[PDB]
Every structure is written in C-alpha cells, then in structure tokens.
Write an enzyme that holds these catalytic residues in place. Structure first.
Site, PDB file in Angstrom:
ATOM      1  N   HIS A 122     -37.229  60.006   1.220  1.00 28.82           N
ATOM      2  CA  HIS A 122     -38.182  60.657   2.064  1.00 28.82           C
ATOM      3  C   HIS A 122     -37.699  61.616   3.024  1.00 28.82           C
ATOM      4  O   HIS A 122     -38.436  62.431   3.546  1.00 28.82           O
ATOM      5  CB  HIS A 122     -39.508  59.637   2.736  1.00 28.82           C
ATOM      6  CG  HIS A 122     -39.792  59.034   1.514  1.00 28.82           C
ATOM      7  ND1 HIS A 122     -40.566  59.642   0.694  1.00 28.82           N
ATOM      8  CD2 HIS A 122     -39.965  57.645   1.256  1.00 28.82           C
ATOM      9  CE1 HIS A 122     -41.137  58.823  -0.401  1.00 28.82           C
ATOM     10  NE2 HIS A 122     -40.803  57.527   0.150  1.00 28.82           N
ATOM     11  N   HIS A 166     -42.524  52.315   3.342  1.00 30.71           N
ATOM     12  CA  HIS A 166     -43.322  53.050   2.492  1.00 30.71           C
ATOM     13  C   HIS A 166     -43.707  54.363   2.912  1.00 30.71           C
ATOM     14  O   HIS A 166     -44.048  54.388   4.089  1.00 30.71           O
ATOM     15  CB  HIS A 166     -44.525  52.416   2.056  1.00 30.71           C
ATOM     16  CG  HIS A 166     -43.901  51.051   1.022  1.00 30.71           C
ATOM     17  ND1 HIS A 166     -43.306  50.897  -0.068  1.00 30.71           N
ATOM     18  CD2 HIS A 166     -44.085  49.517   1.657  1.00 30.71           C
ATOM     19  CE1 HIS A 166     -42.922  49.703  -0.365  1.00 30.71           C
ATOM     20  NE2 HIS A 166     -43.391  48.625   0.833  1.00 30.71           N
ATOM     21  N   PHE A 167     -43.989  55.095   2.257  1.00 36.00           N
ATOM     22  CA  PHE A 167     -44.673  56.486   2.015  1.00 36.00           C
ATOM     23  C   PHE A 167     -45.926  56.206   1.507  1.00 36.00           C
ATOM     24  O   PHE A 167     -46.044  56.480   0.298  1.00 36.00           O
ATOM     25  CB  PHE A 167     -43.892  57.696   1.433  1.00 36.00           C
ATOM     26  CG  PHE A 167     -44.374  58.711   2.259  1.00 36.00           C
ATOM     27  CD1 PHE A 167     -45.560  59.417   1.640  1.00 36.00           C
ATOM     28  CD2 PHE A 167     -43.713  59.404   3.337  1.00 36.00           C
ATOM     29  CE1 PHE A 167     -46.188  60.531   2.311  1.00 36.00           C
ATOM     30  CE2 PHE A 167     -44.332  60.440   4.182  1.00 36.00           C
ATOM     31  CZ  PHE A 167     -45.277  61.135   3.557  1.00 36.00           C
ATOM     32  N   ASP A 168     -46.849  56.180   2.568  1.00 36.44           N
ATOM     33  CA  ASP A 168     -48.213  55.953   1.785  1.00 36.44           C
ATOM     34  C   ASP A 168     -49.019  57.290   1.416  1.00 36.44           C
ATOM     35  O   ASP A 168     -49.577  57.433   0.578  1.00 36.44           O
ATOM     36  CB  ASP A 168     -49.151  55.074   2.904  1.00 36.44           C
ATOM     37  CG  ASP A 168     -50.146  54.364   2.171  1.00 36.44           C
ATOM     38  OD1 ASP A 168     -50.125  53.480   1.363  1.00 36.44           O
ATOM     39  OD2 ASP A 168     -51.274  55.048   2.071  1.00 36.44           O
ATOM     40  N   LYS A 185     -39.826  60.389 -11.583  1.00 41.08           N
ATOM     41  CA  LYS A 185     -40.587  60.052 -10.531  1.00 41.08           C
ATOM     42  C   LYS A 185     -42.016  61.052 -10.372  1.00 41.08           C
ATOM     43  O   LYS A 185     -41.605  62.220 -10.265  1.00 41.08           O
ATOM     44  CB  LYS A 185     -39.992  60.045  -9.147  1.00 41.08           C
ATOM     45  CG  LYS A 185     -40.332  58.682  -8.489  1.00 41.08           C
ATOM     46  CD  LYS A 185     -39.795  58.781  -6.875  1.00 41.08           C
ATOM     47  CE  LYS A 185     -40.886  58.034  -6.002  1.00 41.08           C
ATOM     48  NZ  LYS A 185     -40.415  57.905  -4.766  1.00 41.08           N
TER      49      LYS A 185
HETATM   50  N1  LIG Z   1     -47.832  61.014  -1.282  1.00 44.61           N
HETATM   51  C1  LIG Z   1     -46.922  60.526  -1.635  1.00 44.61           C
HETATM   52  C2  LIG Z   1     -47.168  59.373  -2.564  1.00 44.61           C
HETATM   53  C3  LIG Z   1     -46.218  58.672  -3.198  1.00 44.61           C
HETATM   54  N2  LIG Z   1     -45.031  58.839  -2.623  1.00 44.61           N
HETATM   55  C4  LIG Z   1     -43.875  58.339  -3.439  1.00 44.61           C
HETATM   56  O1  LIG Z   1     -44.504  57.588  -4.592  1.00 44.61           O
HETATM   57  C5  LIG Z   1     -44.781  56.030  -4.337  1.00 44.61           C
HETATM   58  C6  LIG Z   1     -45.665  55.206  -4.580  1.00 44.61           C
HETATM   59  O2  LIG Z   1     -46.006  54.936  -5.876  1.00 44.61           O
HETATM   60  C7  LIG Z   1     -43.877  55.788  -3.003  1.00 44.61           C
HETATM   61  O3  LIG Z   1     -42.948  54.952  -3.115  1.00 44.61           O
HETATM   62  P1  LIG Z   1     -42.537  54.165  -1.641  1.00 44.61           P
HETATM   63  O4  LIG Z   1     -43.866  54.170  -0.460  1.00 44.61           O
HETATM   64  O5  LIG Z   1     -41.938  52.998  -1.749  1.00 44.61           O
HETATM   65  O6  LIG Z   1     -41.522  55.106  -0.851  1.00 44.61           O
HETATM   66  C8  LIG Z   1     -43.311  57.003  -2.789  1.00 44.61           C
HETATM   67  O7  LIG Z   1     -41.860  57.099  -2.531  1.00 44.61           O
HETATM   68  C9  LIG Z   1     -44.872  59.867  -2.056  1.00 44.61           C
HETATM   69  O8  LIG Z   1     -43.635  60.123  -1.633  1.00 44.61           O
HETATM   70  N3  LIG Z   1     -45.623  60.554  -1.502  1.00 44.61           N
END
Ligand SMILES: Nc1ccn([C@@H]2O[C@H](CO)[C@@H](OP(=O)(O)O)[C@H]2O)c(=O)n1
Length: 124
Positions: free
Chosen positions: A12, A119-121, A41
């Site tokens: 990210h 996490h990136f929500d 991904k």
């Molecule tokens: N808006 C978003 C939604 C999902 N994601 C990616 O998709 C995943 C969710 O299934 C995320 O896992 P993480 O939060 O572990 O990084 C992330 O890395 C993202 O990078 N941006």
C-alpha cells in the site's frame, strides 16, 4: 515471514511518487510489490504519502471497518492515492490492471504496539 505492519507497507505504500503518471502504473507496481505472484489480486490501493503521514491516521477519525470491527480510522484530510483494479480481460499469470489516480481520504485498520496500519479498508 512478514509482519502485518511490513505487509501493509509492501502492499500500500508508494511514498516515492506523488501520483501515478502512467496508465501503466498498476501493471508495474502490482508485479513489483509481488502481488501477481500466485494469482492476480483483484483490487489494491497504493498511497503516495509518507509512511508517518499514513501511520498518523491511526489516531484520527474512528469508524467501523466494513467487517463491523471498530479499529478502523478515516484520515481527516484527503491523500494522493492510486486505485488498481483487475480488468475483466485479465488472465493469470498475465495480470492486467486499470489505474485510477485520485485524492481521497483513506480508512485503515490499526493494531499493535506501536498501533500502526495493518489493513487497507477503503478510500472515500
Ligand atoms: N479499497 C481497497 C480495498 C481492498 N484493498 C486490498 O484488498 C484487500 C481486502 O480483501 C486488502 O487487504 P489488506 O487490508 O490486508 O491490505 C487490500 O490489500 C485495497 O488495497 N484497497
């Protein structure tokens, strides 16, 4: 055997550019941060801010995660982001991505000590 913190950084953080210049941005980064490895991904965001600027978000606006956990945080300001999304043409190991560059707020899930993004929500 990557920590959660280091994994989020690898996925990210793109503090090196201010913005995605090219339509090719997603294709190179997704491959380059090792995200097309076993699979394409579907969605990944890259954040063109400093790592400390993104770590601070863990102390901003507290919101529910989309999971209804309550350890997510919305940045007070907008931020330079690149949203990468797989096209419907796309075929692993030949992953292809559509690049969208925007200024949006980000929402992150924080944990630990130090309490940093894991996490990136979503971006809003
Ligand atoms: N808006 C978003 C939604 C999902 N994601 C990616 O998709 C995943 C969710 O299934 C995320 O896992 P993480 O939060 O572990 O990084 C992330 O890395 C993202 O990078 N941006």
């Amino acid at each position: 055997k990557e920590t959660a913190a280091a994994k989020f950084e690898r996925q990210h953080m793109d503090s090196s550019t201010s913005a995605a210049s090219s339509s090719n941005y997603c294709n190179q980064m997704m491959k380059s941060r090792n995200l097309t490895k076993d699979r394409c991904k579907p969605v990944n965001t890259f954040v063109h801010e400093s790592l400390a600027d993104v770590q601070a978000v863990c102390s901003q606006k507290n919101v529910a995660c989309k999971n209804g956990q309550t350890n997510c945080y919305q940045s007070y300001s907008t931020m330079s982001i690149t949203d990468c999304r797989e096209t419907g043409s796309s075929k692993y190991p030949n992953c292809a991505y559509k690049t969208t560059q925007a200024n949006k707020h980000i929402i992150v899930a924080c944990e630990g000590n130090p309490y940093v993004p894991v996490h990136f929500d979503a971006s809003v």
